Amino acid sequence: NTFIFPATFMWGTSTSSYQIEGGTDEGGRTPSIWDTFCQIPGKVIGGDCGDVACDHFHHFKEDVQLMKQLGFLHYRFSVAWPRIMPAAGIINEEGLLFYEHLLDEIELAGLIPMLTLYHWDLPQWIEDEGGWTQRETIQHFKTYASVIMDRFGERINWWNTINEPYCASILGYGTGEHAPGHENWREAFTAAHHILMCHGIASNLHKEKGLTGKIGITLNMEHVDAASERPEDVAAAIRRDGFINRWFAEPLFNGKYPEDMVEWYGTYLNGLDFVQPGDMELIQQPGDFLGINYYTRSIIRSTNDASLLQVEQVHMEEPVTDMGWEIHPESFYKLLTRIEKDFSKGLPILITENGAAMRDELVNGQIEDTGRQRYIEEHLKACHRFIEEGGQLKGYFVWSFLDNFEWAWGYSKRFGIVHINYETQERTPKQSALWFKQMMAKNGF
Ligand SMILES: OC[C@H]1O[C@@H](O[C@H]2[C@H](O)[C@@H](O)[C@H](O[C@H]3[C@H](O)[C@@H](O)[C@H](O[C@H]4[C@H](O)[C@@H](O)[C@H](O)O[C@@H]4CO)O[C@@H]3CO)O[C@@H]2CO)[C@H](O)[C@@H](O)[C@@H]1O
Numbered sequence: 001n002t003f004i005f006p007a008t009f010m011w012g013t014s015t016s017s018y019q020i021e022g023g024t025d026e027g028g029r030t031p032s033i034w035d036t037f038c039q040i041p042g043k044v045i046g047g048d049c050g051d052v053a054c055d056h057f058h059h060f061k062e063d064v065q066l067m068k069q070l071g072f073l074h075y076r077f078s079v080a081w082p083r084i085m086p087a088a089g090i091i092n093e094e095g096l097l098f099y100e101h102l103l104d105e106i107e108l109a110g111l112i113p114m115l116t117l118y119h120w121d122l123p124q125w126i127e128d129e130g131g132w133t134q135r136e137t138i139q140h141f142k143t144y145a146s147v148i149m150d151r152f153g154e155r156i157n158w159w160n161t162i163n164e165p166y167c168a169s170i171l172g173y174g175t176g177e178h179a180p181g182h183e184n185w186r187e188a189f190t191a192a193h194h195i196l197m198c199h200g201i202a203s204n205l206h207k208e209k210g211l212t213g214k215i216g217i218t219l220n221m222e223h224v225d226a227a228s229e230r231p232e233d234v235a236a237a238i239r240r241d242g243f244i245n246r247w248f249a250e251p252l253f254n255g256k257y258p259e260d261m262v263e264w265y266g267t268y269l270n271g272l273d274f275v276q277p278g279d280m281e282l283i284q285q286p287g288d289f290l291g292i293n294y295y296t297r298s299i300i301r302s303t304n305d306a307s308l309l310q311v312e313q314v315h316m317e318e319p320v321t322d323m324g325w326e327i328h329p330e331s332f333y334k335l336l337t338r339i340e341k342d343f344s345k346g347l348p349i350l351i352t353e354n355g356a357a358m359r360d361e362l363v364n365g366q367i368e369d370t371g372r373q374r375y376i377e378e379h380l381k382a383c384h385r386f387i388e389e390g391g392q393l394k395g396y397f398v399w400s401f402l403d404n405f406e407w408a409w410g411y412s413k414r415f416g417i418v419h420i421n422y423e424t425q426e427r428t429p430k431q432s433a434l435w436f437k438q439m440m441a442k443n444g445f
Helices: 033-037 056-069 093-109 124-128 136-151 165-173 185-208 231-254 259-272 279-283 329-344 370-386 407-412 431-441
Strands: 010-014 074-078 112-118 158-163 214-220 224-226 290-293 298-302 311-313 349-354 393-399 418-420 427-429
Touching: 010 349, 033 124, 056 093, 056 427, 074 158, 074 393, 093 112, 093 136, 112 136, 112 185, 136 185, 158 185, 165 185, 165 214, 165 231, 185 214, 185 231, 185 259, 185 279, 214 231, 214 349, 224 231, 231 259, 231 279, 231 298, 231 311, 231 329, 290 329, 329 349, 329 370, 349 370, 370 393, 370 431
Parallel strands: 010 074, 010 393, 074 112, 112 158, 158 214, 214 290, 224 298, 290 349, 349 393
Antiparallel strands: 298 311, 418 427
């Protein structure tokens, strides 16, 4: 019962600019879609916003240091587009300088970075122009991806293009639940096609510059089980699987959308009119690795309701996070397995986000987060059984170095291995972070 991981296995943590940085009106930065969205009554638990957050804008030196001391080799962060492109075609030099310095600190501690170009903080001025439902957005993206790549990239070992196109498009324009908060399936599907092109856009800029860094997109995926053996339930689960995974995984690897999904969406796709000649080829570029974010599985059953997919998530109460999310590590094994067979057929796979939000309690200045630790460990064994069976898992970034703006959940949800005290801003590593330090040292509990 030992779990030793490969020699070269990549151990990191991740964050995201809007969720940790704060300094929203500082340093030339202008409002993102989330600064607006967060203000709409009822959209984010408690009214919470990304103002201040963990204030990583001023604390960046100690955070990257706390990583070093926690025995991390890799750090995955994102760049806040609004810090870089605060208005149309301007290039804010003070914003580039924050990341440059952040990168100085990174290399000073001897850490290896991964920069995510897009992690959901679209500059509002772009949403004003139409947001992700306009092709022109892609040109703006180009502008933004070009600056970051000239300014860095002799320096960046790992490029991550889009984080989770599913959330920014589907939840962003479709269900309303993420910024900017639209409820329009036509837009959602239009936006998903544009964001997926930006991965391509950025993949082209990367080769035209001849950079040596690895590059890849990140999809959030979810394993999907039918609720019962009834056929309409089996059908239901096929639809959920197409809706999160195949709609985004298919174009990237095979240059097409899932036909059953295209048939199901029908009128909302307006005959794929948003697809110009050459787009799908632009999209279909798996690059150097597949980034995956995984948290839980869905148990799906069919309904005959008014929703796009006509599906119901059966709400499992068995081991769950503070988010109602079920801990089912076996399913992380079955998802990794399926990703290799379809789509990724030998390309390196990186888990760019994996973690859990449990209720925390400070006790004698320590955090006994046995749930979070239990959850990480279990999924790491699921990650282990997949390696050994010939799985191309090369890396694993624990989601969230720090407790942070947990989107629509606000600050009510804590995913950090390092506890943030929002009254004083002081960082305090939790028992799980101490566990992760011993684990990377022995390279495998
Ligand atoms: O929040 C931290 C974390 O989250 C990630 O983004 C998450 C979201 O937090 C979350 O809101 C979201 O929840 C889903 C869910 O997976 C679906 O089952 C669901 O589908 C619904 C639907 O909204 C209805 O239209 C319909 O009638 O049925 C179904 C249920 O049957 O909708 C929601 C949104 O409410 O999903 C995300 C994961 O996919 C990030 O991925 C990550 O970075 C974060 O750390």
